[PDB]
């Protein structure tokens, strides 16, 4: 029709235009969800423990120059700041243990493990923990398109054999993808203290280009040699009592020790579709350079204002939509006034009227942490979204008098402020400024609310509790933790063997327990590392082949139990369905019902006449197979004999149900003429 | 009749579609160009 094809063309054009504009909008901007996090800060693991707990009050700076490392003491420390080869200020936090490694778990020879920078070992451990704490089985990531975009610097070397020693301290350590088996791009950047931040930026672009599905972003340091603590001491920049004070009355700029941080990013739509967990959203970033300043290492306010405005424009937001900002503290005598003035100029100018812009800094409580500083700031902000509180440590009372602190709507976070949910969706910003002169700004937003769920269980319903992945770890010993890591104060179910990330494929060892009452894991299974058990399966598998071939047997004629169970008939639905189907198939030729005999209901015939015994067993056997096949166990070479030849044929698909049933009954009846 | 209106609307829609496709191509597959180069190489090479 002349008046219809034109309408169809118009409709197609409108739909295509809408789709094209939506695609353009998606390409130029797209929310990125943070799925999981993992960190290793000096003094304690990660997430809550070393965070919302410590961040409530603060502390740190345990000093204690490490003794495990060589680090000749009684010579580095000297009161004279002008001494040639010494350094003052002997404080400064440090990692509890940096030489720890498992080696055998990741499959590396101890000789190669010894000649290995601690950054790589800590990165491997933290990456495994990060993937684990996301509900994603690490073994399923093999062959995917995830990439790593981290930032690492070279901190000292071993000054003291056919290989290594030219590949372990190689900076470009993308061996994480080698061990895990990834295929995305692997990049190691270096842009001084802001490196992690700019690294993050790169990842975002890839996530919007479709060349990667998920990204791993983070940073690390180890501070192996004394090194910096000496050199900066000769520059009179580092100051004593190394507690860094941000926006106060002190000037130290203390170069705090190591720290490792990693986060996992994925496109929001994919995260919603797959069914992962979303913690926070990233929706814009900006990078720039200080340009020609009054010195190689000197901040420039105009560049910071420009980058802040650029980030705000890229996000498509307004400067009045941000409630809290994390600052690049680095407490010195010059950086803090410049940063404060820049923030007042860009975020000020009649912000609201009454709402002040809260300001804080993590480095005032945990230290500079070298290259992994910026991402560490993220680890603060997101937690503030997940607890409805602003962890305002800021261990300094009197503000800096150089900057016009008053006459503005930017209030220092002296105490603590509620951060509850509700209207006016929460937003935050982080910033980083490196030594080389590269500046970065990032805006983050609270995750959408979707939490309804349901409640089930609490019935009898026996639940398997396959071990928490007894694995390649020493074939022993580690079972201990799995025995004790499952301590339940008040909970139930907790399916570990489920698709849950803990799966770990139970690499080699494996173990199991089945119950519905209590734990019973602290029982024999616990002492299985040094003893035996009572009624629990213990296996020494070697996963010779992960997927074994499967065969079934089908000989009976002698089972003759007293009723082939009935509780499974009532509970398992597939068993009952197959039993009923077989009974219906056999109904129109013989009067007896297999279900009635099975239930031992009154009026059922005794298990003496063969005409009942032979068919009933058959009606059971096939059903059992239907159960096994229902659990992903597919046989290949059923070889059962005697009266089970026909059952095997039915399982093999060579015969129909009614044909086999009628053959069974006829054979039994004709044989019944012979007895004694 | 109504044929003229439908034709005009279809033409405007096609024009907008062409603009959108050009924008997408410039966003994702825009060719880049090389202006000049410099190098220092073993021996006397320079230029």
């Amino acid at each position: 029709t002349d008046s219809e094809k034109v309408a169809e063309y118009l409709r197609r054009a409108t739909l295509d235009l809408r789709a094209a504009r939506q695609r353009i909008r998606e390409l130029e901007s797209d929310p990125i969800a943070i799925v999981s996090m993992a960190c290793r800060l000096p003094g304690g693991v990660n997430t809550p423990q070393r965070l919302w707990e410590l961040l409530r009050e603060g502390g740190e700076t345990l000093s204690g120059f490490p003794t495990d490392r060589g680090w000749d003491l009684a010579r580095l420390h000297h009161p004279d700041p002008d001494n040639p080869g010494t350094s003052y200020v002997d404080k400064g936090g440090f990692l509890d243990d940096a030489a720890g490694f498992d080696a055998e778990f990741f499959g590396v020879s101890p000789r190669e493990a010894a000649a290995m920078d601690p950054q790589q070992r800590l990165l491997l451990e933290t990456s495994w923990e990060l993937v684990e704490n996301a509900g994603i089985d690490p073994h399923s990531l093999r062959g995917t398109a995830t990439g790593v975009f981290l930032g690492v610097a070279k901190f000292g070397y071993g000054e003291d054999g056919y290989s290594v020693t030219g590949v372990a301290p190689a900076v470009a350590s993308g061996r994480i993808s080698y061990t895990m088996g990834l295929e995305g791009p692997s990049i190691s950047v270096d842009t001084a203290c802001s490196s992690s931040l700019v690294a993050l930026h790169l990842a975002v672009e890839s996530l919007r280009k479709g060349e990667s599905s998920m990204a791993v972003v983070g940073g690390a340091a180890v501070m192996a040699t004394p090194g910096v603590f000496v050199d900066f001491s000769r520059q009179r920049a580092l100051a004593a009592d190394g507690r860094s004070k941000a926006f106060g009355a002190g000037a130290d700029g203390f170069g705090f020790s190591e720290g490792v941080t990693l986060v996992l990013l994925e496109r929001l739509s994919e995260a919603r579709r797959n069914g992962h967990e979303v913690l926070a959203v990233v929706r814009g970033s900006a990078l720039n350079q200080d340009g020609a300043s009054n010195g190689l290492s000197a901040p420039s306010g105009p560049a910071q204002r420009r980058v802040i405005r650029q980030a705000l424009e890229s996000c498509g937001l307004e400067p009045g939509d941000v409630d809290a900002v994390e600052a690049h503290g680095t407490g010195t005598a010059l950086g803090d006034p410049i940063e404060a003035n820049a923030l007042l100029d860009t975020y000020g100018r009649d912000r609201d009227a009454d709402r002040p812009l809260w300001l804080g800094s993590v480095k005032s409580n945990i230290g500079h942490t070298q290259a992994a500083a910026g991402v560490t700031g993220l680890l603060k902000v997101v937690l503030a979204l997940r607890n409805g509180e602003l962890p305002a440590t800021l261990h300094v009372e009197e503000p800096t008098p150089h900057v016009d602190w008053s006459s503005g709507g930017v209030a220092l976070l002296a105490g603590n402020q509620p951060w509850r949910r509700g209207e006016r969706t929460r937003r935050a910003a982080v910033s980083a400024f490196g030594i080389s002169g590269t500046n970065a700004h990032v805006i983050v937003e609270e995750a959408p609310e979707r939490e309804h769920r349901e409640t089930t269980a609490h019935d009898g319903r026996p639940v398997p509790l396959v071990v928490s992945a007894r694995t390649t770890a020493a074939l022993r010993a580690q079972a201990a933790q799995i025995a004790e890591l499952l301590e339940r104060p008040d909970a139930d179910l907790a399916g570990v063997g489920l698709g849950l990330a803990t799966t770990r494929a139970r690499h080699e060892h494996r173990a199991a327990v089945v119950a519905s009452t209590r734990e019973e894991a602290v029982r024999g299974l616990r002492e299985i590392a040094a003893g035996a058990a009572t009624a629990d399966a213990v296996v020494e598998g070697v996963t010779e082949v992960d997927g074994r071939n499967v065969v079934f047997l089908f000989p009976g004629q002698g089972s003759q139990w007293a009723g082939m169970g009935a509780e499974l008939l009532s509970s398992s639905p597939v068993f009952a369905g197959k039993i009923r189907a077989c009974d219906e198939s056999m109904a129109p030729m013989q009067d007896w019902k297999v279900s009635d005999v099975l239930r031992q209901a009154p009026g059922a015939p005794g298990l003496d006449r063969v005409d009942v015994v032979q068919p009933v067993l058959f009606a059971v056997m096939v059903s059992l197979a239907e159960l096994w096949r229902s659990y992903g166990v597919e046989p290949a070479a059923v070889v059962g004999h005697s009266q089970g030849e026909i059952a095997a044929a039915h399982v093999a698909g060579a015969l129909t149900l009614e044909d086999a049933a009628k053959l069974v009954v006829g054979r039994s009846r004709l044989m019944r003429s012979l007895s004694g | 009749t109504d044929s003229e209106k439908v034709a005009e609307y279809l033409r405007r829609a096609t024009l907008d579609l062409r603009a959108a496709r050009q924008r997408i191509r410039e966003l994702e597959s825009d060719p880049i160009a090389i202006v000049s180069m410099a190098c220092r190489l073993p021996g006397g090479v320079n230029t």
Partner: antibody
Amino acid sequence: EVQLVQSGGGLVQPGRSLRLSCTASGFTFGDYAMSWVRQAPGKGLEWVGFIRSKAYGGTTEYAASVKGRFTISRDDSKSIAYLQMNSLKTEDTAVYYCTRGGTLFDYWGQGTLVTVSS
Amino acid sequence: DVVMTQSPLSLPVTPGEPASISCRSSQSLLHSNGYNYLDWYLQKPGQSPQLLIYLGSNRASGVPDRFSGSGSGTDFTLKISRVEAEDVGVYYCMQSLQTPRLTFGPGTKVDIKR
């Protein structure tokens, strides 16, 4: 981009004609109407002739309150849309401009002011 | 079966604050499959007017994305997320179920609230 080169205008003096015309480029004349809108000084604008012309039909469709006074004319096959203005009147002093459609006045251009009075 | 048009006729605005304009008809402008025959026109002071958006929500190229159209039946609305200082002009509704359609009439005006 620059398909509106509307030019013309003058004092006319009542009882005269005019050479109002607009030139176009870029697009194709053969599949486009013209339309014409005049804006009175300090008043609302209105369609000069309800043009709805050119294309396959090639009709005229003069507007009401004209009855050939404004001389629809509208030569087409010269990349021009010249509209004759013979037998003018003191009332119709206004700024006239063309258009690039029949019902979708999407693309417009600079108009020309014509005053007929003394 | 002529259809009238109307507008609030007055809407002083300030930068940053959004804006909305309602426009109602006398009879439904729907077609055999919908697609209300409604268009919006804007004239800046000193230049000829240009088309803003047609067929409901089909904002044409070149027009800033801050404009959006909605509505159906006998009522439609034009929304601006953020108002700036470069647009004062005048706005007119336009219908396309007919053809002898004369001048828009009063339309509506935009000024700076003070």
